[PDB]
Design a protein around this motif. Structure first.
Motif, PDB file in Angstrom:
ATOM      1  N   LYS A   1       0.875  -1.191   0.000  1.00 17.13           N
ATOM      2  CA  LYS A   1       0.000   0.000   0.000  1.00 17.13           C
ATOM      3  C   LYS A   1       0.914   1.244   0.000  1.00 17.13           C
ATOM      4  O   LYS A   1       0.749   2.138  -0.863  1.00 17.13           O
ATOM      5  N   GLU A   2       1.881   1.324   0.913  1.00 15.04           N
ATOM      6  CA  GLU A   2       2.636   2.592   1.100  1.00 15.04           C
ATOM      7  C   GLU A   2       3.756   2.722   0.057  1.00 15.04           C
ATOM      8  O   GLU A   2       4.392   3.789   0.026  1.00 15.04           O
TER       9      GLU A   2
ATOM     10  N   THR B   1       6.680   1.225  -0.095  1.00 17.53           N
ATOM     11  CA  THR B   1       7.987   1.202   0.611  1.00 17.53           C
ATOM     12  C   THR B   1       8.649  -0.163   0.445  1.00 17.53           C
ATOM     13  O   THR B   1       9.840  -0.299   0.741  1.00 17.53           O
TER      14      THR B   1
END
Length: 167
Positions: A62-63, A65
């Motif tokens: 999601k992020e 990263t």
């Protein structure tokens, strides 16, 4: 007039250039850098397809990263598949991510213990030269791509890696 400059341009000239100086902690600026990253990556994949060199898939958390997927490498018409992953460093995109190919851990000198690929000393200054115009598409085109094109043929010739027979 440098051979280096022309070589880099021939590889990356049709990869969309990235703009935003933002890493994982940079909130709305990071969401912006992720749009640039995704836009660049997808264009690189489309170019790769038209060139019959569709050689990887990536997805993120999601992020955005944590990145992971597969790369494919063709040798004597046999296609070899390797699982890949990397973290986005806190100081991205000034600092370059470190691709891992975990399955090749311990199988080549051109890898750190733990599976991070070992690029030649020319990658990192080329990245630093171009900040923040290069992103994940460039990391694949200029980092993992050239590494595979030396290491994989070597490991196949040394019988260190074998082709997974499949239908």
């Amino acid at each position: 007039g440098s051979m280096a400059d022309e070589a880099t341009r021939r590889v990356v000239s049709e990869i969309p250039v990235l703009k935003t100086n933002a890493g994982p902690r940079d909130r709305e600026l990071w969401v912006q850098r992720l749009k640039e990253e995704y836009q660049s990556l997808i264009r690189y994949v489309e170019n790769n397809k038209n060139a019959d060199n569709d050689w990887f898939r990536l997805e993120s958390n999601k992020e955005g990263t944590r990145w992971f997927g597969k790369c494919w490498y063709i040798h004597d018409l046999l296609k070899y598949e390797f699982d890949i992953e990397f973290d986005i460093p806190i100081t991205y995109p000034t600092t370059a991510p470190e691709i891992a190919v975990p399955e090749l851990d311990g199988k080549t000198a051109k890898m750190y213990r733990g599976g991070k690929i070992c690029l030649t000393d020319h990658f990192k200054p080329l990245w630093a030269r171009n900040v923040p115009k290069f992103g994940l598409a460039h990391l694949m085109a200029l980092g993992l791509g050239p590494w595979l094109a030396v290491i994989i043929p070597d490991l196949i010739q040394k019988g260190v890696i074998h082709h997974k027979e499949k239908c």
